[PDB]
Amino acid sequence: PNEECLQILGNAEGAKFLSDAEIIQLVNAKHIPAYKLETLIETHERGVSIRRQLLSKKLSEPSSLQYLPYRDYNYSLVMGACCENVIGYMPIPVGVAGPLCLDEKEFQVPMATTEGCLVASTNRGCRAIGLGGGASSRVLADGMTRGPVVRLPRACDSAEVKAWLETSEGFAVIKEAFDSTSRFARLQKLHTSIAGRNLYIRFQSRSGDAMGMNMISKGTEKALSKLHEYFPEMQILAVSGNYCTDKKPAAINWIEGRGKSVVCEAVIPAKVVREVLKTTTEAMIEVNINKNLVGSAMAGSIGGYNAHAANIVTAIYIACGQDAAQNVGSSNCITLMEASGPTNEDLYISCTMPSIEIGTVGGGTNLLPQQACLQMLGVQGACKDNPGENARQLARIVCGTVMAGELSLMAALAAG
Amino acid sequence: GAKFLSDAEIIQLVNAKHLIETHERGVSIRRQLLSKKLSEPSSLQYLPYRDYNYSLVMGACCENVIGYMPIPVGVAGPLCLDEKEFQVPMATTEGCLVASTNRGCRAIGLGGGASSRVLADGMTRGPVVRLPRACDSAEVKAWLETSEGFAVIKEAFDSTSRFARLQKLHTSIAGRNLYIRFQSRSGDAMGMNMISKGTEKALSKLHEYFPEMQILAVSGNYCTDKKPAAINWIEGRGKSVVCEAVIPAKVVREVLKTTTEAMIEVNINKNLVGSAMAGSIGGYNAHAANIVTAIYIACGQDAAQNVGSSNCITLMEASGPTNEDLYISCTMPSIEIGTVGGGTNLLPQQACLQMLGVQGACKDNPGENARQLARIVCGTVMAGELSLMAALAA
Amino acid sequence: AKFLSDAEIIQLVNAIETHERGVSIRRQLLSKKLSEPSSLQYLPYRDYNYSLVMGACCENVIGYMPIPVGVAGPLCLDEKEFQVPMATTEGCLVASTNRGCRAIGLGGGASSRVLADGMTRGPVVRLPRACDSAEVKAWLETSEGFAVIKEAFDSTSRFARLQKLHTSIAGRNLYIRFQSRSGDAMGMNMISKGTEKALSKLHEYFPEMQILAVSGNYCTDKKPAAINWIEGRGKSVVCEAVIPAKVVREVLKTTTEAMIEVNINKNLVGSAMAGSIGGYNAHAANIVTAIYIACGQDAAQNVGSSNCITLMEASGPTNEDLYISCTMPSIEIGTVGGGTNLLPQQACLQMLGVQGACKDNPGENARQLARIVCGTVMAGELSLMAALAAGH
Amino acid sequence: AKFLSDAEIIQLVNAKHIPAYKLETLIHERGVSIRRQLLSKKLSEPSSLQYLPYRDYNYSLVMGACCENVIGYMPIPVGVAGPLCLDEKEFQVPMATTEGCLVASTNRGCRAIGLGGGASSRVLADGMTRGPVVRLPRACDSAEVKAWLETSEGFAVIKEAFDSTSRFARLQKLHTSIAGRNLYIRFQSRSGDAMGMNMISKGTEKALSKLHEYFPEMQILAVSGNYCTDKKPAAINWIEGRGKSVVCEAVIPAKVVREVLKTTTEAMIEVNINKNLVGSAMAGSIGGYNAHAANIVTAIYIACGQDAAQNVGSSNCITLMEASGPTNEDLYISCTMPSIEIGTVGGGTNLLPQQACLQMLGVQGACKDNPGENARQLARIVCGTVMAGELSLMAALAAGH
Numbered sequence A: 001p002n003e004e005c006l007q008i009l010g011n012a013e014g015a016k017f018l019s020d021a022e023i024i025q026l027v028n029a030k031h032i033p034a035y036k037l038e039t040l041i042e043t044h045e046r047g048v049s050i051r052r053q054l055l056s057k058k059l060s061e062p063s064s065l066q067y068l069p070y071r072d073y074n075y076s077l078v079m080g081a082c083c084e085n086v087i088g089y090m091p092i093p094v095g096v097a098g099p100l101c102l103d104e105k106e107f108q109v110p111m112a113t114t115e116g117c118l119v120a121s122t123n124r125g126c127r128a129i130g131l132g133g134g135a136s137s138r139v140l141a142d143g144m145t146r147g148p149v150v151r152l153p154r155a156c157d158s159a160e161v162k163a164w165l166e167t168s169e170g171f172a173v174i175k176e177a178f179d180s181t182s183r184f185a186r187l188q189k190l191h192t193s194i195a196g197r198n199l200y201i202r203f204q205s206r207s208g209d210a211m212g213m214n215m216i217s218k219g220t221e222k223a224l225s226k227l228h229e230y231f232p233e234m235q236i237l238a239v240s241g242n243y244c245t246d247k248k249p250a251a252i253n254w255i256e257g258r259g260k261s262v263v264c265e266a267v268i269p270a271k272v273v274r275e276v277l278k279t280t281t282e283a284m285i286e287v288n289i290n291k292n293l294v295g296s297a298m299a300g301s302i303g304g305y306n307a308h309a310a311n312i313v314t315a316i317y318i319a320c321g322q323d324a325a326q327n328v329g330s331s332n333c334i335t336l337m338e339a340s341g342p343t344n345e346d347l348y349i350s351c352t353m354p355s356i357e358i359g360t361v362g363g364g365t366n367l368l369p370q371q372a373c374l375q376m377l378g379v380q381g382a383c384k385d386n387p388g389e390n391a392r393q394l395a396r397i398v399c400g401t402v403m404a405g406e407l408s409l410m411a412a413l414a415a416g
Numbered sequence B: 001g002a003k004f005l006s007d008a009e010i011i012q013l014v015n016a017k018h019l020i021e022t023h024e025r026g027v028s029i030r031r032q033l034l035s036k037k038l039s040e041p042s043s044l045q046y047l048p049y050r051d052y053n054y055s056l057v058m059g060a061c062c063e064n065v066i067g068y069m070p071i072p073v074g075v076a077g078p079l080c081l082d083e084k085e086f087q088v089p090m091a092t093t094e095g096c097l098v099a100s101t102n103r104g105c106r107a108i109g110l111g112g113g114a115s116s117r118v119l120a121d122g123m124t125r126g127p128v129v130r131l132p133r134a135c136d137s138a139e140v141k142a143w144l145e146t147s148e149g150f151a152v153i154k155e156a157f158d159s160t161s162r163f164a165r166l167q168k169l170h171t172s173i174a175g176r177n178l179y180i181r182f183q184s185r186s187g188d189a190m191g192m193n194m195i196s197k198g199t200e201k202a203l204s205k206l207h208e209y210f211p212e213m214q215i216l217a218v219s220g221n222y223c224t225d226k227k228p229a230a231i232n233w234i235e236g237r238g239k240s241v242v243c244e245a246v247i248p249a250k251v252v253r254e255v256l257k258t259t260t261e262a263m264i265e266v267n268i269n270k271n272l273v274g275s276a277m278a279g280s281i282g283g284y285n286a287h288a289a290n291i292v293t294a295i296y297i298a299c300g301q302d303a304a305q306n307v308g309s310s311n312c313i314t315l316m317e318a319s320g321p322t323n324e325d326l327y328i329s330c331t332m333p334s335i336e337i338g339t340v341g342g343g344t345n346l347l348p349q350q351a352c353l354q355m356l357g358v359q360g361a362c363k364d365n366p367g368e369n370a371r372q373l374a375r376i377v378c379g380t381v382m383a384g385e386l387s388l389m390a391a392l393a394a
Numbered sequence C: 001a002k003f004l005s006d007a008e009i010i011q012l013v014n015a016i017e018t019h020e021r022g023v024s025i026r027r028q029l030l031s032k033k034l035s036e037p038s039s040l041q042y043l044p045y046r047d048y049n050y051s052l053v054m055g056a057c058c059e060n061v062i063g064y065m066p067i068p069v070g071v072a073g074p075l076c077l078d079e080k081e082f083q084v085p086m087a088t089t090e091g092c093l094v095a096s097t098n099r100g101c102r103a104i105g106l107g108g109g110a111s112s113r114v115l116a117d118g119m120t121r122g123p124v125v126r127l128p129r130a131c132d133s134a135e136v137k138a139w140l141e142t143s144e145g146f147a148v149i150k151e152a153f154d155s156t157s158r159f160a161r162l163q164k165l166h167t168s169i170a171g172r173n174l175y176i177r178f179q180s181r182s183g184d185a186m187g188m189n190m191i192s193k194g195t196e197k198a199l200s201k202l203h204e205y206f207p208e209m210q211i212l213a214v215s216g217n218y219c220t221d222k223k224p225a226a227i228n229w230i231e232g233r234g235k236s237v238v239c240e241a242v243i244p245a246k247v248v249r250e251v252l253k254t255t256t257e258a259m260i261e262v263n264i265n266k267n268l269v270g271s272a273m274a275g276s277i278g279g280y281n282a283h284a285a286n287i288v289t290a291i292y293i294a295c296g297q298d299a300a301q302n303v304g305s306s307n308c309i310t311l312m313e314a315s316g317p318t319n320e321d322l323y324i325s326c327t328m329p330s331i332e333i334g335t336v337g338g339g340t341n342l343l344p345q346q347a348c349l350q351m352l353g354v355q356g357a358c359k360d361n362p363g364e365n366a367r368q369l370a371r372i373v374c375g376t377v378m379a380g381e382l383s384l385m386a387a388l389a390a391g392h
Numbered sequence D: 001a002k003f004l005s006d007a008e009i010i011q012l013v014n015a016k017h018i019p020a021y022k023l024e025t026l027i028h029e030r031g032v033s034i035r036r037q038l039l040s041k042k043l044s045e046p047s048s049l050q051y052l053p054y055r056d057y058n059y060s061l062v063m064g065a066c067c068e069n070v071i072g073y074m075p076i077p078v079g080v081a082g083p084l085c086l087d088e089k090e091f092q093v094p095m096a097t098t099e100g101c102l103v104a105s106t107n108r109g110c111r112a113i114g115l116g117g118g119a120s121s122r123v124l125a126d127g128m129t130r131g132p133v134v135r136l137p138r139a140c141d142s143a144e145v146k147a148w149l150e151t152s153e154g155f156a157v158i159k160e161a162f163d164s165t166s167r168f169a170r171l172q173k174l175h176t177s178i179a180g181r182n183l184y185i186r187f188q189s190r191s192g193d194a195m196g197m198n199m200i201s202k203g204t205e206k207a208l209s210k211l212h213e214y215f216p217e218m219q220i221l222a223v224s225g226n227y228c229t230d231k232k233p234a235a236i237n238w239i240e241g242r243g244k245s246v247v248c249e250a251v252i253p254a255k256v257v258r259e260v261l262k263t264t265t266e267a268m269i270e271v272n273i274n275k276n277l278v279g280s281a282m283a284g285s286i287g288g289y290n291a292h293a294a295n296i297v298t299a300i301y302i303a304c305g306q307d308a309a310q311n312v313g314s315s316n317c318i319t320l321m322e323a324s325g326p327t328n329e330d331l332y333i334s335c336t337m338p339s340i341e342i343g344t345v346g347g348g349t350n351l352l353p354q355q356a357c358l359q360m361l362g363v364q365g366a367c368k369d370n371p372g373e374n375a376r377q378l379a380r381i382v383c384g385t386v387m388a389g390e391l392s393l394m395a396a397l398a399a400g401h
């Protein structure tokens, strides 16, 4: 009825003795507040069921959520960690491009997308590479960043703090405070910029196999606590002052790197360019120069000297539990093509991606389906013997798959 | 046919270099084939695949399919936008993102609501052609800028589809390269394939006037699609949108745990000065990409287009009788979006579109559903900016 | 003053007849305040025509700075020959540019085209709300709205002919980019006059509009900006030439294949790694700056006027000939007004056959000068790139 | 050749008895006169050089050093803006320009700064750069070279080869970027008081010679691969700095903003945010978050014998304005300029008229007891004068009319 239901709710034995309708009655009349539903209802799926039911009555079409699935999904690894106000899950089709012949190994790359032909095209690119003797890649740099903004009374004071951070002694003190927060914390050279009394400080460090935002933030907050002891008039405006730079386009990531900086390359014989890619080396180069270099230049691109790196980065990231919003900066790529061999008929190809933001532990990689795709690549979880090696390998795979994707689309655009 | 054989027998046929009548059994066999090639043969255990509607995916949205990836969906709302309320779905695995955005919606609702406008509408495709000499490409640019030249090109472009309605051309020369940016609305479709078809016919017509022209590529990165580029920021691409709200001083204190004065200081020195020092083009915001990407995954959009669709400048100012109220606006000139085609043909993705009342084509007013979804995106972005900026202020 | 002494006038102030004595007195007054009173010893000031400078080109004038002018030519451009003046203090610059001119000449000369023409100004206005700024953008975009604004703008001057508007919104800010030719003048003052009269007219339709500044940096004038690269500003120009393989080896001391390699990997890839917007060239700014100083241009406008993409590819039957092109979207320039009122810089404009207004075809002298700047830049690219390729 | 006449030498070249442009070796003031006379008859108007000055100017320091094929010189009017009250000092700033009202406006900016207790500046960083592109057979090999250059022992070997070419050559930390088999190497060092291009180029070439021993396969494609970056707009100069990075600031009392600048603190903050931050942002600027730094930079440079072409990057500036004081009524202003490329020795600073302008500011030539102090000081004057210019123009725009 209503009164009886509240007696049963407050009875230490609880909400599981009420029906869905009785609980909703109690919400509509203002006896139980919308937010408290999380702790009161026992099972996670039943919490989702009720939130959906409440939501449906507020929609102009109450049957809207019919085909949004929710049942029998492991919400235990999601509640309090990955999502709030959960009403179900969104299934994204997963496909496989491979084998990807990279650094003398073969990889079957999972790709989550709803764009027709993207996987097939990426697959034909892998085929060209494989018959061409495989690709090779190198991690050139490694370190996630966080770029807080502090304010001092005057610009002369901000300059003083900058000079202090650049002394051997001052940096060593900040480094100890940063490095004390974690096993993996290992602060690299600080990069700083002034704008008046503003001072942007870019902390960079490895972070084992995790993407590292949480870890770099704990090291950063304690590093600024130490800096405040030497400069007590300094104010910390924001733990992020956009100098990182995270999830926005920025030259600083392209130039300094962020996360993993990777280069990949292959040489495709003329015969493979002809039979797999249906074009010539000469035609490919002409398209690459005038589209990926000259065209991006006329559009005023910073870091966007590629055909569709973002397609590959986004499909792999969604499949592999990465933060897909980091496609903004992680897609940064320059794709170069030149003639190779004795008569300039073989295609040399390289992709350079200075800011791959990636990890195999933490965040979405804690969910089991996301982990199935990480296991396909042999990169799931933390590498105990060699910390960071799995995330490094996953970066290489992304760069190699991007190259495969650049090969195929460019050959398609070359013919017509 | 294949139904009279077992799994092991069909697999024997594939291994000897030599069809299946259900989509799901096709998926199963591909998974078994793939699993023998992996170092951990059990790695696919927790990748689900059963009972998914593969009939709308095969031959349309994905190839070599081995299952699906579940992304948790949460709701941020109610979002009070243009005298209406929306419950915004957000597919994400980042803890706190949905809660933070939800808090931004709460501040906006208590402050009277947000208001938005679509400022421009047209998807683009930017091919690169070339002529024997730069003088020749200059002749072609000139011809295209005459009203008679543009009219014959518009006639060719427009004949390919109902919604193909060529707007003003934008051209750029680099030596004998000519980059031509074609632009048009596309109903409620995002419109890539449609504009591509109009482009092919228009260039074919241009060749009749200029036979020495070579079409080097149907995209010469002048569009620009899925790469950062100032041209999308300055000219727009897809929907250009602005949203705004005024948040009373009291609400900023109670819901957001800061003050108007503090919000302004952080916005200016983070989203304007900070982004400036970082050398940003179009990234003058805190985390528009989090909300764009989450809404996109949930609503069947092309998540790769978060690259350009995330472009956003966030501005905060003093407001009201005593300058204690918080004016906020987000401006997003290049939201690339649609409610038909691509991932929006799938049923779960269509559930999230039905939530917002923007699913499929609007018959009475073509494009209105895609326009409305772009406004919701800009409003949900503004909500997400409100809260995170407030969190960073404290 | 005529009956007084240099010293008595100086004591009057502490406690004029001609311009040169006004300069002499200012120099002496200033020399008192310097730690080294004889600093101005070798700063020349005598026998300079100060009448055209006062109240027009410079204030508090203590003299003038001599910048060596050298000549690079002949430059065979559009079947004409040009002796290009270059005011510089950088050694080897004129000499290198000259070698590039010689290379082009032996390849049959350069061809250029003006692709677009219109100086801009980009005010920022504010409305009470973003919805009001959007209403104004929409109004400006209708044919009737644009026509009202065009009539206003065009009424201020005989050369004021308003082209298509370009606008951008940022909340309640609206940025409006006005564009028009301006005869042979660079045209900032003219464009500004037309802009303010047009904004006044816009205010009659939208009284709540606040005009924040007549430049809101949307122009964009004398700062690096992608809008100039993509939409253009002033004159947009392309120049090209084909250098025979024999000329590349003999005059330039390199090969076609080596030139293409250096250009791709320095001017495209290198500039791309450096995060350049509009700087896809070797040293356009050197040539631009030198011509500008010599021809009475606003040298500060070298910021955007130097915007350039230099391309090189194989040409001819053998694929051994060198094709070169420079594309310069935003050359800001004029042959009337400002520093081109002065007689010495007019001498340099007279060398080029472009001094003053073109009466038969207004704007044609400024266009011609922009073609010369782009051609001379291409010559400078040719030579510096050759020298980088051959490597000492 | 002095025993012949003008008309005779010209008759010899026209008749082709003597090679034309190989005559000024046999013949400086008269060498110019003959080049002009020969040149005038090739022109559509043979009297066009009439009013181009050439007599009574020292061409000896100019010939084979600053200019070639010289036909005269171009006078640029020089105004003075001052006193500029900067770091407890007072400067009279030479500004060579032909733009009306520029000197006057900058002057009003100086006047407001002086009446607000003056400005303060700091050099934040210092070092000229050169950014060659080298090529290895493969990206993997280019990666090898980048890892080697990053080891402390690889760096010291390169640092010793770099520092050997000059006493001022002190190589700072190397910055590298890979693009396939391309490696771009940004060499940076102080250069005393010189702007330092030729000096850094010397040390770079020797340094690459050393690197060529450890990796014989390396091709030096070009001594500049645009990674410096010199005389083109580039985010790398904005983010890393180049030449001198400098910051300047002052507080203008409210009353001074009203009486001298004819506006208010509130109006100035508003215009600055929406023009120099938001406006530049909408226009797609990297490094151009200012009103007209280029005007001031260009004018000082021309007057002081700097390379005016380097105004492209030297003008990079962000101008910030903010409420100051107890009632938020005073104006805080600051200009940050990360890439002022400048020098007081070498190039155009060797010419005497240019040296007079340098002497005016007390920075001509080398500072013997503190090397580089004169160029640093000039950099600070540039940034201070830029801030004066921003003050005045922004107030003019804020008021209107």
Ligand SMILES: CC(C)n1c(CC[C@@H](O)C[C@@H](O)CC(=O)O)c(-c2ccc(F)cc2)c(-c2ccc(F)cc2)c1C(=O)Nc1ccccc1
Binding pocket: A116, A117, A118, A119, A120, A121, A122, A124, A307, A308, A311, A408, A409, A412, A413, A415, A416, B125, B196, B218, B219, B220, B221, B223, B224, B225, B226
């Ligand atoms: C499937 C993808 C990878 N793809 C695209 C879309 C890429 C899109 O998401 C980003 C681009 O917009 C980025 C850019 O280039 O600016 C096109 C495509 C591209 C551009 C265009 F204008 C029209 C179509 C093509 C394609 C290009 C030429 C053909 F003649 C045909 C198709 C393919 C593609 O790779 N198809 C493909 C199928 C089976 C096997 C091999 C190959």
Ligand SMILES: CC(C)n1c(CC[C@@H](O)C[C@@H](O)CC(=O)O)c(-c2ccc(F)cc2)c(-c2ccc(F)cc2)c1C(=O)Nc1ccccc1
Binding pocket: A146, A217, A239, A240, A241, A242, A244, A246, A247, B094, B095, B096, B097, B098, B099, B100, B103, B286, B287, B290, B387, B388, B391, B392, B394
């Ligand atoms: C959940 C998200 C939206 N969030 C983040 C991550 C945003 C991330 O995806 C983009 C950023 O990297 C973009 C940028 O700013 O550069 C932070 C966060 C940000 C930066 C940082 F260094 C440390 C943490 C915060 C946060 C900020 C201040 C606090 F004091 C605490 C948390 C929140 C956040 O919104 N938390 C939140 C929870 C419940 C309710 C309300 C509010």
Ligand SMILES: CC(C)n1c(CC[C@@H](O)C[C@@H](O)CC(=O)O)c(-c2ccc(F)cc2)c(-c2ccc(F)cc2)c1C(=O)Nc1ccccc1
Binding pocket: C090, C091, C092, C093, C094, C095, C096, C097, C099, C282, C283, C286, C383, C384, C387, C388, C390, C391, C392, D130, D201, D223, D224, D225, D226, D228, D229, D230, D231
């Ligand atoms: C005279 C000028 C045009 N020049 C320069 C300086 C250009 C300078 O102001 C802009 C550059 O910095 C822009 C850039 O490329 O980044 C160099 C020069 C360039 C770079 C460098 F590291 C060392 C020297 C060269 C040069 C280059 C290679 C040689 F092996 C020798 C000289 C010349 C030049 O063109 N000299 C020259 C003389 C007679 C005839 C032909 C040719």
Ligand SMILES: CC(C)n1c(CC[C@@H](O)C[C@@H](O)CC(=O)O)c(-c2ccc(F)cc2)c(-c2ccc(F)cc2)c1C(=O)Nc1ccccc1
Binding pocket: C121, C192, C214, C215, C216, C217, C219, C220, C221, C222, D099, D100, D101, D102, D103, D104, D105, D108, D291, D292, D295, D392, D393, D396, D397, D399, D400, D401
């Ligand atoms: C003398 C210069 C420094 N100045 C300019 C031109 C600057 C020009 O080279 C760069 C700009 O284009 C950069 C930019 O803002 O984008 C304007 C000017 C600017 C823009 C415009 F649209 C109309 C005029 C002004 C000015 C501005 C408002 C007034 F109401 C009047 C004039 C002055 C100026 O400083 N005048 C001035 C005179 C005596 C004393 C004090 C002050």
